[PDB]
Amino acid sequence: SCRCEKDEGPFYTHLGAGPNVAAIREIMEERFGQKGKAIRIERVIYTGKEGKSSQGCPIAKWVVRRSSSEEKLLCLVRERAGHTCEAAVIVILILVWEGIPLSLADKLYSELTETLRKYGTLTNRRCALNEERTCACQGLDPETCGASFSFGCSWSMYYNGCKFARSKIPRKFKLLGDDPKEEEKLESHLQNLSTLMAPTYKKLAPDAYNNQIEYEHRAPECRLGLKEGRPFSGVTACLDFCAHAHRDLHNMQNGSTLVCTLTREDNREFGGKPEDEQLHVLPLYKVSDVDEFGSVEAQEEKKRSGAIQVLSSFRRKVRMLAEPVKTGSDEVWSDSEQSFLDPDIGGVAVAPTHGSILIECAKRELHATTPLKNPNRNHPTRISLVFYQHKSMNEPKHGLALWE
DNA sequence: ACACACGTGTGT
DNA sequence: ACACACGTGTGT
Ligand SMILES: O=C(O)c1ccc(O)c2ncccc12
Numbered sequence: 001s002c003r004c005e006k007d008e009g010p011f012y013t014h015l016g017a018g019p020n021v022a023a024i025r026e027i028m029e030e031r032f033g034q035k036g037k038a039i040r041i042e043r044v045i046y047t048g049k050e051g052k053s054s055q056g057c058p059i060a061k062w063v064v065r066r067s068s069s070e071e072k073l074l075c076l077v078r079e080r081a082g083h084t085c086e087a088a089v090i091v092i093l094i095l096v097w098e099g100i101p102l103s104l105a106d107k108l109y110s111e112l113t114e115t116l117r118k119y120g121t122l123t124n125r126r127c128a129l130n131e132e133r134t135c136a137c138q139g140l141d142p143e144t145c146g147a148s149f150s151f152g153c154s155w156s157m158y159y160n161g162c163k164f165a166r167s168k169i170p171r172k173f174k175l176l177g178d179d180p181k182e183e184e185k186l187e188s189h190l191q192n193l194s195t196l197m198a199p200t201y202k203k204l205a206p207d208a209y210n211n212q213i214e215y216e217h218r219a220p221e222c223r224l225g226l227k228e229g230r231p232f233s234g235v236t237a238c239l240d241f242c243a244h245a246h247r248d249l250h251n252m253q254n255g256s257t258l259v260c261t262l263t264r265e266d267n268r269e270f271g272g273k274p275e276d277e278q279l280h281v282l283p284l285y286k287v288s289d290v291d292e293f294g295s296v297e298a299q300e301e302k303k304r305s306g307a308i309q310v311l312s313s314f315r316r317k318v319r320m321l322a323e324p325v326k327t328g329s330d331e332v333w334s335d336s337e338q339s340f341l342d343p344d345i346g347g348v349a350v351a352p353t354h355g356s357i358l359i360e361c362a363k364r365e366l367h368a369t370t371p372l373k374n375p376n377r378n379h380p381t382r383i384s385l386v387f388y389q390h391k392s393m394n395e396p397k398h399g400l401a402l403w404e
Numbered sequence: 405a406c407a408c409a410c411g412t413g414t415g416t
Numbered sequence: 417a418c419a420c421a422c423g424t425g426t427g428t
């Protein structure tokens with residue numbers, strides 16, 4: 001809508017936009033209700049060159065880490081090359097460090113782990129594997145490997161609408177076999193969490209939130225949540241799951257995704273040094289040489305303090321399946337040397353904390369999560385709860401009338 | 405173009 | 417217990 005192509009990155013404003021970085025701080029200070037050090041903004045640069053290992057699997061090159069307990073809100077922004085207009089700078093990620101009560105995050109971790117390991121039905125996804133479909137990033141033990149579990153409503157190409165188009169009584173929280181008591185406990189946890197996160201979503205990304213509630217009263221059966229204001233329709237739980245680089249292509253246009261992170265008990269204090277850790281990665285971005293306010297020295301101090309961790313290349317042994325998964329293993333050397341030799345190969349990661357809430361337009365931005373050293377969904381290093389709304393979920397009763 | 409998706413119910 | 421049926425956009 002200005003008079004200033006793919007190489008500048010995807011253009012959208014429903015998370016926030018302004019003429020310069022200072023304007024983004026003004027927006028976020030008003031939205032969040034606090035000023036100054038409570039809000040941190042990082043400039044990130046779109047390169048379009050994807051960081052990945054020699055086997056095609058996700059890597060991080062820089063890690064944005066919470067700088068102190070005084071930092072409450074992290075915002076990643078992209079300045080669009082060449083633009084001087086009202087939307088020259090756009091917001092691509094919002095992270096609330098203190099998202100949900102820690103006692104609730106503690107309880108969800110244990111309850112969801114136990115329920116999903118004794119009754120969970122695995123939901124298969126394309127991003128579970130690399131391009132060649134031969135990696136072992138989830139682990140190779142079927143009893144313990146990382147896995148994804150999907151609930152709520154989902155879009156289906158066979159009905160061009162909700163997958164429950166001809167389900168007399170849909171089970172949004174289906175578990176293995178039939179146990180209504182266990183499914184109701186799981187449903188109660190995730191419905192309560194949907195209800196809690198909706199006001200945070202409205203507060204911090206109001207334009208994306210408002211888009212997601214436009215047809216709430218037209219398709220109530222395809223929405224989660226217990227109170228007025230229901231932006232979500234589906235939720236996926238990921239337990240030690242390595243999401244290879246992808247976009248969520250059938251998410252609705254002009255919406256976003258909210259991610260609630262839960263972590264193992266050894267990674268729940270700010271001063272901690274956990275044994276393992278999973279990161280959320282934007283593979284097409286690099287970090288800036290200046291901080292939010294344009295200072296070179298400020299950015300260097302954040303690198304020395306760990307607030308921005310500059311990683312170096314690795315060479316590790318991994319497994320490679322002898323035959324690809326359709327649609328035995330061997331030990332091979334996997335390295336990231338070439339991704340680190342090129343300064344313009346991307347890989348900006350964030351380290352979300354226990355109980356944090358992350359907001360990003362997963363439909364437009366390429367993203368990934370890193371593989372765990374020893375995945376174990378029975379005692380996961382990280383659980384992510386991923387809340388979204390698919391496209392074409394706007395018909396009553398899961399679109400039963402259209403299907404007829 | 406063109407292989408590829410956070411599936412379910414009915415049929416045989 | 418499989419077997420069939422139902423057929424959408426995006427990235428490349
Ligand atoms: O951060 C995660 O754990 C995550 C995992 C798998 C996904 O498909 C995601 N999609 C959008 C945002 C986050 C995620």
Ligand SMILES: [Cl-]
Nearest residue numbers: 256257362363
């Ligand atoms: Cl999204």
Ligand SMILES: [Fe+2]
Nearest residue numbers: 246247248362
């Ligand atoms: Fe995703």
Ligand SMILES: [Zn+2]
Nearest residue numbers: 057130135137
């Ligand atoms: Zn992999």
Ligand SMILES: [Zn+2]
Nearest residue numbers: 002004083085
């Ligand atoms: Zn412009």
Ligand SMILES: [Zn+2]
Nearest residue numbers: 153162222398
């Ligand atoms: Zn539905």
